[PDB]
Design a protein around this ligand. Sequence first.
Ligand code: ZN
Ligand code: ZN
Ligand code: ZN
Ligand code: ZN
Ligand code: ZN
Lengths: 88, 88, 88
Amino acid sequence: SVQTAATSWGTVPSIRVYTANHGKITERCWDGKGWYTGAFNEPGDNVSVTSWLVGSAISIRVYASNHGKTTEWCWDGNGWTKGAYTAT
Amino acid sequence: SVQTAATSWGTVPSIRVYTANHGKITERCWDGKGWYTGAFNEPGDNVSVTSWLVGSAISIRVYASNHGKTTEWCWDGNGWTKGAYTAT
Amino acid sequence: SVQTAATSWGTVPSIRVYTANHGKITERCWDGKGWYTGAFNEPGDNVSVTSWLVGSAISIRVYASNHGKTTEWCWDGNGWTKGAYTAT
Ligand SMILES: [Zn+2]
Ligand SMILES: [Zn+2]
Ligand SMILES: [Zn+2]
Ligand SMILES: [Zn+2]
Ligand SMILES: [Zn+2]
């Protein structure tokens, strides 16, 4: 009262699983060898994710919902940044 | 309870974020310039989504769950229609 | 609290809708003709899914959360097998 969101890309593939548990959203990564803890760590009770490739460059969008409000987080190769998404 | 589902397609990309809040599911859209409110509006407490391309034409399937029942909604270019999906 | 997750692949397309309801996760499938009940059946309150292709062969990963623990399930052509995923 655990909630997950998953995305994958490429043919290896790379997989990312985001878990919202105890008011925190964390990330677990698979790139073909084993699972490791990712850099994503934001407060939230709910999470959704989508991702796309531009050649070999991955872009991830994580929608983290905390206390009635939804924040979009972007991964575009170098660090997680807050996105332009708003609910209204 | 906010609960979201997201899908994306193409290289721009186009992103669709569906939010179930206060018994209603609404849609926000990104097509490369800015976020705008989509046409989708159906009752529901939970939402999932998947999409696929047929060349450049998008097909979206939204699964909206409301009061114990799941209804599929289809976007195939010209309007949201009710899908053939049943749970059993 | 019905909670769903969806994935699709190819041009037909094939669609898989996973539903967590009454402490069980079941699967409904569409391969171009009609909806039918799939072999996936595991205990759980929450579910997410991701899939990818290697040619026309589908690989599906289902993340089933039951009583605080998340188990990854793999479909790689011949049966559902437990995956290496751990939360930590
Ligand atoms: Zn707990
Ligand atoms: Zn909280
Ligand atoms: Zn509220
Ligand atoms: Zn309701
Ligand atoms: Zn249970």
